[PDB]
Write a protein that binds this ligand. Structure first.
Ligand SMILES: Nc1nc2c(ncn2COCCOP(=O)(O)OP(=O)(O)OP(=O)(O)O)c(=O)[nH]1
Ligand SMILES: [Mg+2]
Ligand SMILES: [Mg+2]
Ligand SMILES: [Mg+2]
Ligand SMILES: [Mg+2]
Lengths: 265, 1064
DNA sequence: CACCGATCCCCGGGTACCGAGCTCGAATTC
DNA sequence: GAATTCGAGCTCGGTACCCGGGGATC
């Protein structure tokens, strides 16, 4: 059909609808970098870099032909290509088609909507079909390589880890990992710690023996993880870089990630 | 000797030597800054080349021409001068009180002394003879008067009948406001010493109604003697019994004229048969000024004794033959005009510059004022001479040098040499200037109402009007030039001379004196009142002539007198059927609409009857119109009962406009353009008759007549719309009325629907007819409608025929006239606001829409959808070229070369900047930034160029110092500054306003939804964003690879693969 | 002292909601 | 006793007027 065709009917739209379900308007004024391997939705929250990979396996049919494409999600700067995938924006949706049609520097994406009716047919709400144009020059700086050590957390665990973190330039935090798993997030007037094994007292992680002490400058790390309203997941550290980075990736059906820049040792 | 002491400097032996120190060649290298000052005792000297002579010594030689006969009493004419004078063009009429005790020695006849016995007012007719002689005829007689109602004054001030300056008589006039009004008995109260009436009209018994107490003595002279004009040939006549003109003796000369007479109105005749204009002289001067203070990059200020005039260009044309006769250059200090400039002058046939050198500023200005008195140019011009040049010079001459200017005009003393500026008077619409017997036609004001430019600087006007690329000297480069030797002062002298030559070229392209003089002849006002005192005195004087003939009198109302509100209901503007109309759109419109209503329906003050008793003895429909105006029933009796006065008034002016238009088809294109502007000026004087009725707290208003004019206008517009819709609704009825419609039936379904209208026009969207002979049939359509509906002077006429029209909004539309030109009507391409960049790109866009087919097809296709349906599906592929222009402008606005003259917005100051209530305007910001920097502060109706400078930390803190998103009135620099300091422009603003102009015009393509248009126009633009500086660095430190611009597609795809696995 | 009219569109600045978000902690739910 | 919609409660832009002013058009 369309030279790039990305089809999300229902029974996969409920997966993606669950991904945007964590209760966010946040990732609306974003940028979608579509291409092979899927759509990547990158946005900046408080100054931090948030990502949502959407693999090609997460659409009913994904076909992409040509160079990577970048769309502002904000269609016409009021509506948004992703406002469709909110929880209850459009109650009765059944299918969404994301067709890109054009020639590499100047492409356009169309997004169609189809809302449910009775007796097996679908109303195309043509008042609300959206058409956006590829950005046609851009650069985004995406996270790279592999983690050296990742630690998986849970919802209350990550909530208390965020609670430990500071408020202002008064309070730098510190994600020290000692020898044998004593992963710990402290500040002057707060400390949290836990053990990492590869009943209730077992977080999981990988390559935990690689001790470190990264140190966080920015208070925003708390705020970001609540804006996203993240429910816990992997906490991956990158230390083979001049400026170390911690990514934090929600462990649910979706992959919304947020990378924060750590100061050295 | 002289009976009237001469108040111009004929002699000086001591004055105030101000002069720069950089003129002093033998003086140490740093004893150069500042100026000299302080008294010096020597007669003021002028150095012309090698020679020198005193400025005020007329004698044998002379460095500038002289047309004066007297000079401080000595009679410098060749002996035996006694020219006979039989015909004498008159260009200005002065009036001045003259006391018979002052003229004991003037040796008049009896019949002038008895006309001034304590005092009289004397009407001086200034002029030329066919032989170049400056005449001055003094018309004795001619006393002002007003009327007061006999009974009203008799009861309000018991009457049973020095005290003889107020001679009175019982006349039988009738008031001009109503048809029911009866001729009462009035007293005609002859004032002399006219000023005294100004007290006795505001102050003597203010509960009586004075009738014509505002009518000056000149108007009594012009009107009381039928035929007389304020500008035209005259002739001395034998007189009532035989009384003759009494040629004065040179000591009794009141003006600087060659010959003078003492006539009365019976010794003068109008002398038609001469039409041509005599040998009158035109001065076209231009001063150049230096600032001599601590900051000599400040703009000169006349009050500061060290901010001095340095140069005065002065060209001396002949007004009739248009020949530049003299090129004078006054110069403080040595001035050697460049040989390149001298040779360009000699090449063009122009006289050689006579550069006059002076030591002191006083000597220069005294020599200029001595030239102005000696040469005595009847007409002066220049560019902005009323806001800068004459105010600078007179400020110098009166504050700094204490020179009386009352004698430097055409009278030898006690004359007016005043300049007036708007200066928060809140009624003055212009800055005036009145030198007596000298007609100052500032070409600035002549050009601002003859051409639409954003900037009216003389370089911009020279390029736009003469197509003459002049080079401008900034007032900032005059210190640096003047400080160097005489050659650089000569370079300044070149730029001064070239300024005045350009202004002479403008004057002789437009010839304002001729057009203005036609208006002054027809109105009854002198030519200086024509230049300056508005439209109401024209109408009032013409109406006063009519009234006084018909036996009426015009009551005085302002004696009983000292936003955006309206006095009555104006005109109907039908709702446009907005859109791109690719079918023919015939524009009918009434010719001289409101004048034709005033004549057709006989509207006046004298024909209105507010009460139905005055017409209780006249038939309805046959003898009087009856109209509900403002909810009030009004009866306007028809002619054959009483002719309107506004009708005959309008006859004269409509004949003038029609004769000017009857010379357009037979003229060159560049002179047809001037003729178009002249007939538009007479159109304005015709519509000001209507406007004069409806001016509240104006001279002689009647908002009943004004509201009737507009009321009948609205009924005529609707009557025309219903006639077109009813009669020609089907094509067969069009074919029955005009059989030539058979060969105009285009294939489609016919219709003829008015799609817009305005005060008079109606835009008939003729579907199914071809545009070819639609104007040929439109003349017949219009004649048919004018015959079926309206009374004879009313005349609907097919004005245009658009093959394409973009009815944007009510007073906005664009359209290409048939087979022909583009007509742009109020869509911001024709507006003085914008910057040349946006105007240029918007014009490119409308040319695409209209001229480029395949964008007109795409645009006409845009209307098959409601606007919002275009938001989803792509615009038809013809609009692609329409977006290339926008894209190009986006590109072209960011590219860093950007001479910022393309980005200069303007706005007119238009009132004292403290008279604003909303004081946060961009041009007001720049006005105060200019006054802060000692720059050239604009004047109340100037246009204030400004750029919108980029939001930078520096500008922000500067604004808070003089005191998120700053307003565009705080990012409001002026372009000279923003070039000097390379502050960079607000690209965000300028592109948002480019799209704003595109959106305002082309929302008509998208069902007039500005938002849908805005969205669809920003779709063309290539969006780009980069992770900002100081951020991509630290992200690149973290091994973040880039995906996008700076890499091959395989690297971007691959590193996204890596990122998707990492970020997973 | 000075002096044509009205209509009308756009745009900038200024105000007032208004709701749509999120957030915050405090009860309600395992 | 750890979690947790819920409901005030705020902020942050729209969106709607709305008034002055520029400056058109009749
Ligand atoms: N007081 C006043 N009223 C004016 C003014 N301008 C318009 N009107 C109103 O217009 C009436 C008819 O419009 P036009 O002048 O185009 O048509 P016209 O006068 O009938 O002349 P033509 O239609 O023949 O060009 C004006 O300056 N002052
Ligand atoms: Mg000049
Ligand atoms: Mg000037
Ligand atoms: Mg007309
Ligand atoms: Mg008209």
């Amino acid at each position: 059909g369309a030279p790039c065709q990305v089809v999300l009917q229902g029974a996969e739209l409920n997966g993606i609808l669950q991904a945007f379900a964590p209760l966010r308007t946040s990732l609306l004024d974003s940028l979608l970098v579509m291409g092979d391997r899927g759509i990547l939705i990158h946005n900046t929250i408080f100054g931090e870099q948030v990502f949502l990979p959407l693999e090609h396996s997460q659409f009913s049919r994904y076909r992409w032909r040509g160079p990577t494409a970048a769309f502002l999600s904000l269609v016409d700067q009021k509506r948004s290509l992703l406002s469709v995938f909110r929880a209850n924006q459009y109650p009765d949706l059944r299918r969404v088609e994301l067709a890109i049609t054009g020639q590499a520097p100047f492409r356009t994406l169309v997004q169609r909507i189809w809302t449910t009716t009775s007796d097996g047919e679908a109303v195309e709400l043509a008042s609300e079909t959206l058409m956006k144009r590829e950005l046609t020059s851009f650069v985004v700086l995406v996270p790279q390589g592999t983690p050296d050590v990742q630690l998986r957390l849970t919802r209350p665990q990550l909530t208390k880890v965020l609670n430990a973190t500071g408020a202002d330039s008064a309070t730098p935090t510190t994600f020290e990992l000692g020898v044998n798993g004593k992963f710990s997030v402290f500040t002057t007037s707060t400390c949290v710690t836990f053990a990492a094994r590869e009943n209730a007292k077992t977080v999981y992680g990988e390559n935990t023996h690689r001790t470190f002490s990264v140190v966080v400058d920015d208070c925003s790390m708390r705020a970001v993880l609540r804006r996203l309203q993240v429910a816990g997941g992997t906490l991956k550290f990158f230390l083979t870089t001049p400026v170390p980075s911690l990514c934090v990736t929600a462990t649910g059906p979706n992959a919304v990630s947020a990378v924060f820049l750590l100061k050295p040792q | 000797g002289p009976t009237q002491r001469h108040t111009y400097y004929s002699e000086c032996d001591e004055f105030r030597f101000i002069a720069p120190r950089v003129l002093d060649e033998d003086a140490p290298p740093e004893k150069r800054a500042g100026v000299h000052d302080g008294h010096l005792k020597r007669a003021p000297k002028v150095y012309c080349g090698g020679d020198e002579r005193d400025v005020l010594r007329v004698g044998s030689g002379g460095f500038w021409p002289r047309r004066s006969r007297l000079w401080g009493g000595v009679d410098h004419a060749p002996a035996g001068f006694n020219p006979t004078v039989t015909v004498f063009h008159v260009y200005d009429i002065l009036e001045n009180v003259e006391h018979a005790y002052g003229m004991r020695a003037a040796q008049f006849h009896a019949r002038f002394m008895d006309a001034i016995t304590p005092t009289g007012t004397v009407i001086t007719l200034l002029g030329l003879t066919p032989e170049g002689h400056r005449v001055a005829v003094h018309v004795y007689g001619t006393r002002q008067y007003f009327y007061m109602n006999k009974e009203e004054v008799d009861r309000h001030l018991q009457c049973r009948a020095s005290a003889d300056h107020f001679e009175a008589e019982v006349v039988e006039r009738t008031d001009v406001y109503y048809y029911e009004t009866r001729p009462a008995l009035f007293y005609r109260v002859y004032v002399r010493s006219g000023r005294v009436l100004s007290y006795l009209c505001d102050n003597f018994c203010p509960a009586i109604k004075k009738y014509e107490g505002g009518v000056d003595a000149t108007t009594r002279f012009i009107l009381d003697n039928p035929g007389f004009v304020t500008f035209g040939w005259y002739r001395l006549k034998p007189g009532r019994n035989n009384t003759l003109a009494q040629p004065r003796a040179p000591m009794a000369f009141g003006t600087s004229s060659d010959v003078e007479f003492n006539c009365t109105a019976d010794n003068l005749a109008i002398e038609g048969g001469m039409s041509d204009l005599p040998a009158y002289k035109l001065m076209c001067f231009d001063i150049e000024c230096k600032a001599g203070g601590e900051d000599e990059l400040a703009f000169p200020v006349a009050g500061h004794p060290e901010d001095l005039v340095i140069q005065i260009s002065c060209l001396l044309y002949d007004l009739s033959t248009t020949a530049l006769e003299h090129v004078l250059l006054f110069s403080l200090g040595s001035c050697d005009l460049p040989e390149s400039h001298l040779n360009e002058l000699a090449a063009r046939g122009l006289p050689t510059p006579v550069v006059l050198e002076f030591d002191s500023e006083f000597e220069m200005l005294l020599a200029f004022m001595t030239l102005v008195k000696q040469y005595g140019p009847e007409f002066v011009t220049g560019y902005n001479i009323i806001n800068f040049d004459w105010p600078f010079l007179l400020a110098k001459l009166t504050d700094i040098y204490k020179v009386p200017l009352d004698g430097y005009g055409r009278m030898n003393g006690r004359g007016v040499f005043r300049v007036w500026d708007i200066g928060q008077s809140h009624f003055q619409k212009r800055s005036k200037i009145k030198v007596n017997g000298m007609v100052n036609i500032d070409m600035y004001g002549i050009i601002t109402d003859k051409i639409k430019l954003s900037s009216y600087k003389l370089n911009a006007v020279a390029e736009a009007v003469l197509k003459d690329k002049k080079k401008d000297l900034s007032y900032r480069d005059i210190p640096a030039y003047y400080a160097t030797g005489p050659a650089q002062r000569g370079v300044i002298g070149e730029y001064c001379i070239q300024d005045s030559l350009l202004v002479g070229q403008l004057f002789f392209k437009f010839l304002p004196h001729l057009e203005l003089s036609a208006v002054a002849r027809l109105a009854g006002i002198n030519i200086t009142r024509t230049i300056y005192d508005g439209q109401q005195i024209r109408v009032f004087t013409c109406l006063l002539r009519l009234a006084d003939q018909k036996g009426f009198i015009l009551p005085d109302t302002q004696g009983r007198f000292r936003g955006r509100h309206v006095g009555y209901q104006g005109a109907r503007v039908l709702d446009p059927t907005s859109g791109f109309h690719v079918n023919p759109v015939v524009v009918f419109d009434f010719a001289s609409l409101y004048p034709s209503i005033i004549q057709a329906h006989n509207l006046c003050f004298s024909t209105l009857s507010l009460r139905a008793d005055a017409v209780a003895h006249l038939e309805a429909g046959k003898d009087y119109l009856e109209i509900e105006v403002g909810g009030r029933r009004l009866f306007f009796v028809k002619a054959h009962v009483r002719e309107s006065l506004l009708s005959i008034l309008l006859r004269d002016w409509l004949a003038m406009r029609k004769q000017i238009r009857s010379r357009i088809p037979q003229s060159s294109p560049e002179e047809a353009v001037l003729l178009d502007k002249q007939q538009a000026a007479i159109k304005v004087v015709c519509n000001s008759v209507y406007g004069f009725t409806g001016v509240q707290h104006g001279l002689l208003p009647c908002l009943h007549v004004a509201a009737t004019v507009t009321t009948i206008g609205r009924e005529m517009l609707l009557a025309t719309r219903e006639y077109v819709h009813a009669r020609w609704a089907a094509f067969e009825q069009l074919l029955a009325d005009f059989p030539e419609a058979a060969d105009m039936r285009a294939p489609g379904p016919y219709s003829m629907r008015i799609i817009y209208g305005d005060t008079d026009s109606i835009f008939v969207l003729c579907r199914g007819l071809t545009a070819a002979g639609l104007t040929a049939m439109g003349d017949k359509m219009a004649s048919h409608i004018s015959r079926a509906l309206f009374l004879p002077p009313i005349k609907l006429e097919c004005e245009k025929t658009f093959t394409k029209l973009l009815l944007i909004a009510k007073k906005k539309y664009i359209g290409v006239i048939y087979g022909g030109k583009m007509l742009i009507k109020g869509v911001d391409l024709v507006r003085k606001n914008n910057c040349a960049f946006i105007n240029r790109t918007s014009r490119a866009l409308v040319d695409l829409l209209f001229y480029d087919d395949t964008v007109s097809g795409a645009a006409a296709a845009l209307a098959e959808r409601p606007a919002e349906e275009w938001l989803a599906r792509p615009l038809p592929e013809g609009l692609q070229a329409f977006g290339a222009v926008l894209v190009d402008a986006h590109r072209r606005i960011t590219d860093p070369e950007r001479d910022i003259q393309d980005f200069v917005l303007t706005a007119e100051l238009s009132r004292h900047p403290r008279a604003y209530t909303n004081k946060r305007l961009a041009h007001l910001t720049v006005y105060y930034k200019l006054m802060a920097r000692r720059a050239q502060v604009p004047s109340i109706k100037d246009r204030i160029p400004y750029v919108i400078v980029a939001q930078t930390r520096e500008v922000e803190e500067t604004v808070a110092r003089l005191a998120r998103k700053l307003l565009v009135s705080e990012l409001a620099e002026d372009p000279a500054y923003a070039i000097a300091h390379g502050v960079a422009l607000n690209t965000d603003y300028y592109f948002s306003h480019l799209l704003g102009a595109a959106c305002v015009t082309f929302k008509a393509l998208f069902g007039n939804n500005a938002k849908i248009t805005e969205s669809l126009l920003k779709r063309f633009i290539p969006e780009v964003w980069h992770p900002p500086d100081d951020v991509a660095a630290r992200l690149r430190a973290a091994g973040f690879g880039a995906v996008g611009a700076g890499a091959t597609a395989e690297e971007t795809r691959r590193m996204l693969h890596r990122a998707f696995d990492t970020l997973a």
